[PDB]
Amino acid sequence: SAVKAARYGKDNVRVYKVHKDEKTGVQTVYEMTVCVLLEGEIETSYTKADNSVIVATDSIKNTIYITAKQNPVTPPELFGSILGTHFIEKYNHIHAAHVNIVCHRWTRMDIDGKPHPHSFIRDSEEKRNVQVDVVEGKGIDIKSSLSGLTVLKSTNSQFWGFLRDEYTTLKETWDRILSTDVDATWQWKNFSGLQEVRSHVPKFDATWATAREVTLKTFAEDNSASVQATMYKMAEQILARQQLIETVEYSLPNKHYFEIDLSWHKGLQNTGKNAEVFAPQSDPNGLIKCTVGRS
Amino acid sequence: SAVKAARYGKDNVRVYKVHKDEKTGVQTVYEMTVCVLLEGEIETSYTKADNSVIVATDSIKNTIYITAKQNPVTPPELFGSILGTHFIEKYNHIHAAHVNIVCHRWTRMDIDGKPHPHSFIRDSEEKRNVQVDVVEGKGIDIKSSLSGLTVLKSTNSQFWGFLRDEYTTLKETWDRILSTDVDATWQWKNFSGLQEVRSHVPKFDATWATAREVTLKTFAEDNSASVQATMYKMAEQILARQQLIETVEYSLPNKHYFEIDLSWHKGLQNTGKNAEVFAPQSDPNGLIKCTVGRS
Amino acid sequence: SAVKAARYGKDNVRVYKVHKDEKTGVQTVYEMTVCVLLEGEIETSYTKADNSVIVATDSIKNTIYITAKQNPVTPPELFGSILGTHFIEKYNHIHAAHVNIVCHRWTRMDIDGKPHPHSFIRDSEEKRNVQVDVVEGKGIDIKSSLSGLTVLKSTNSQFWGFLRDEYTTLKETWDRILSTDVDATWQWKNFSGLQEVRSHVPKFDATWATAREVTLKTFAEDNSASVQATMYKMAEQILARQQLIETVEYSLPNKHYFEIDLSWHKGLQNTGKNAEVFAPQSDPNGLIKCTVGRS
Amino acid sequence: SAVKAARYGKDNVRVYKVHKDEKTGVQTVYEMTVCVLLEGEIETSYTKADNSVIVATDSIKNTIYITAKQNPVTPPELFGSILGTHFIEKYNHIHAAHVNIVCHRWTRMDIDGKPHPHSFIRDSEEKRNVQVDVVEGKGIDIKSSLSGLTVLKSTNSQFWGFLRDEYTTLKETWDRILSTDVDATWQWKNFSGLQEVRSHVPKFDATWATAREVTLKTFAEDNSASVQATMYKMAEQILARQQLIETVEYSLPNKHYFEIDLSWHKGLQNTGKNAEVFAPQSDPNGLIKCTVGRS
Ligand SMILES: O=c1[nH]c(=O)c2nn[nH]c2[nH]1
Ligand SMILES: O=c1[nH]c(=O)c2nn[nH]c2[nH]1
Ligand SMILES: O=c1[nH]c(=O)c2nn[nH]c2[nH]1
Ligand SMILES: O=c1[nH]c(=O)c2nn[nH]c2[nH]1
Ligand code: NA
Numbered sequence A, B, C, D: 001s002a003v004k005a006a007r008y009g010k011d012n013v014r015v016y017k018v019h020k021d022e023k024t025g026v027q028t029v030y031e032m033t034v035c036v037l038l039e040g041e042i043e044t045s046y047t048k049a050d051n052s053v054i055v056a057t058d059s060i061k062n063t064i065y066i067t068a069k070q071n072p073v074t075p076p077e078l079f080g081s082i083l084g085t086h087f088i089e090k091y092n093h094i095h096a097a098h099v100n101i102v103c104h105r106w107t108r109m110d111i112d113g114k115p116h117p118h119s120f121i122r123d124s125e126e127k128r129n130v131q132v133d134v135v136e137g138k139g140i141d142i143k144s145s146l147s148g149l150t151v152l153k154s155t156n157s158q159f160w161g162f163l164r165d166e167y168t169t170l171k172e173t174w175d176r177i178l179s180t181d182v183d184a185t186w187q188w189k190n191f192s193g194l195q196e197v198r199s200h201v202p203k204f205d206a207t208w209a210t211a212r213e214v215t216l217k218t219f220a221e222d223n224s225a226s227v228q229a230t231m232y233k234m235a236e237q238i239l240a241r242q243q244l245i246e247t248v249e250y251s252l253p254n255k256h257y258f259e260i261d262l263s264w265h266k267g268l269q270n271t272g273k274n275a276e277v278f279a280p281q282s283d284p285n286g287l288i289k290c291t292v293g294r295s
């Protein structure tokens, strides 16, 4: 037998950092969960019990805190690139670092219509994430994403003209509820190293904001022919607005809301044009994915 | 042996309702999870296999949908009271109904600074809840609550002067992070029946909004001596602003963020006044509760 | 305003303890999650910012570890009583301690048909729990429970003869699937203090085992007329077998498995006597509760 | 822009099936959660709103139930292959089906030391899973796995001789607790189609059982030098025992249990050889992965 692939490291490292503006008194907080996995010339730790090649996962944890102390933690694309580069430069036998970061929302509170200097609220479980793969001699690959954005529209969604055969019971519809949890990922062109990532720093926050905006606007405004058709429109616009993105991927559950026929009870009308009360279905759900790139 | 207490019904009934304004085209959605448990002269179903006394839980489910079809579902205090009253009036042998409702947020989207007529976002997992107990001959008891409101302040929290003995290792502090998930419940004076609940309908939404506002403002502005002291201030203000509330209960986890000593690494300073990077602790957590009533 | 009720302490304190038999080499592990909440003359911490009355929750955490170091942690009824008694005896102004313990399963592994001295498996998420309330001058009240026991029987469950009215669509049945998650609690007669709890130590493990056995046997063997009727039979037997129990409470979800009509597809027969494939329903669910005491 | 990749289908389809032996009266139940995603010539549904190419996800759901009605559902490797083959044969424009199945445990109850004919218990959340990719013209690729197997050993684990530098605080140890949740996957040699899968049917259950046994025995018996070294030993043995497996992958969290120094309290000794009470850590955790193949 032989080791075909191996990676190891520390997962679920929670980190909080505060920045204090001495002049204005304003404080800004960041909270993240970080995972770092390393690859390299570490096969002998598996095959020969040779621990000499192992950077202990506890040391990886220490490194994450130290790096957060000495560097900005925002945008996460930059922080992940600094962290990943550290491991490949510090350790001769480590040749790839894989860094995943989940950013948690802490939104500044407005009290009496003014921004509070040091109080924050978690407005939604929506996350901003990055995956950074730093590979010695091959640069830095970054995938940025948003996840956990849950939306619903109560009309202006249709689904008709699909294939009908002996397995089909679904009725065509010209007016339905559409609800989904959005997972969207944009993959950046490969960067040669940290200098190049630094040169593009302003684009990261801007592109995240654009991706969010395009997602929300398109969902709200499209008279949707299907999840497939609406999601393609989203991806198209993101690629148009940021030339440094190579591909956009969306993965969308279709969370069903079923009509409830109440006609058995005193002829109560609650279907089609008369539908007011629906039963949200926890499962099963549609799952629709697409990866869109450039011509 | 004897049956000392019994209740039964249907839990986790998910309901969505849409209202369509024909004039303006504007649609408004409500989504809830409902539990209804009944009590009454039902002992023989347990002791003698006498199912004749059982209103099937499937029928309870049907009733929830039918009631939502025929009545407003907001404020939840009113809907729960209608639903509970139904069971005690319809069934001679049923003498109490216990209705729990969890309201899920669907917030209207703003697209280009204008409210969208039919698109919604789940902004946070914060819930608005009610517990309604309708007891034949004893009226309607309503407890309203908000839960899942997660906040953090990065300074202006202290904790010193606590009891110190041979079990104590905690250092006194004059500057710490305070973060919690807020669970707040206000209990209404007993209502004589549905007519009285209807007469107070405008107070329900107003009091929920007030409770939320007081919670957020007090948390942000109090130079907190302890969780205990800050939560008492909140409860005091709510009771002052709504005479029809008898008691306010808060239950607050104290979610710890620990300093990380980095001095072992190149004398790096990251404690006390130099603390910038902290380790959020998933567990254990403080849990602090108080029920405040009128003198 | 006045403080009507208050309690505070530490939740989610995870504890592991190992016992090593020097003679035999055999090791036995225990893992628990503990919550301790205190009550007493602590109102001024809420109303006057007087921290002098507060035993810090961090100290409560220390106390739990110290108590586990110096005492047996099994049965949990004894450990909880020791822990609760500690607080009311040590602190003059603390008059009640509320201790909740969840015991996690670590079952010794059998390797080649022999018990391994030091390796364990988590066989199921079933828990054994206790709630111990130690109140100065009123003794020790203990509720023991098992939870998270999930069972299913594929036949020998019926449900017919229930009330039918204009809200009813449910068909009567003489053969259905019954599946539930069992939550069973037995409440001990009040104990005068720790000496009395110690005198009954062997009964705790025995009664837990009996409750589990009675639950499983009755469920498997009863030709069930309803969840209500079957659960009553369980509670009856437990009360018969342990005179020191005052009441038994069961809380049982009825997790539905629906027939799927496939006759639309090539006349496929999959209902009634021909039912083979079913759709488990995640929600809604029946919820059936009973508390049984002595005549 | 262009569609680079696309797949869509139905997730979280819960299925139960019962087999009734008429002769013996014995019933056997199977419960699974299934996901089916399709690929093929479906780009126009995204780019041109052409629904004519879409097999509705609701139809996919129907197909899963119909296929379960007409075929055995065990072993899951066979069922997944039948289901995936169906879609590529039935629909000309569908060229790949991806089927994921999670099997839930329903273990027959023993009542009074005899197997019950129709009553079952969920003993643990351990799962048996399969991923089946059926690609037109390229055969059937099957990955089988077990997941959610949680184990702990209280001694006979060491970790010393790792790299020490200015980022390292971890002390070397010759005796520690090792606990993990096991995720193990074995990938079968490619099969040419359903006939070949059928010819190997007895190997699927046997190999699952072997993988489980090897995992448990090796964990219990290895005087472990590291997670890396122990997991390699497991993978080696599985590959030796089943020639039709090409690779074995393990992914193992290292769930830490920390010593608690209690010496500050009355010189209490609870570290090193005196360690009895430990604090399980919910996060962070080590994460160690390896893929082992043949020379
Ligand atoms: O078994 C281990 N492997 C590792 O890589 C490691 N790192 N810290 N502790 C550890 N234990
Ligand atoms: O056992 C049952 N008890 C009930 O109360 C009920 N209601 N619907 N189905 C049911 N099954
Ligand atoms: O606000 C606090 N209240 C408490 O009771 C406590 N105990 N430890 N830390 C604490 N902080
Ligand atoms: O938007 C949809 N896309 C689909 O592929 C589908 N299948 N059923 N319903 C559906 N809705
Ligand atoms: Na390197």
Ligand code: NA
Pocket: B087, B088, B089, B090, B091, B092, B093, B094, B095, B136
């Ligand atoms: Na009545």
Ligand code: NA
Pocket: C087, C088, C089, C090, C091, C092, C093, C094, C095, C136
């Ligand atoms: Na006392």
Ligand code: NA
Pocket: D087, D088, D089, D090, D091, D092, D093, D094, D095, D136
């Ligand atoms: Na095909």
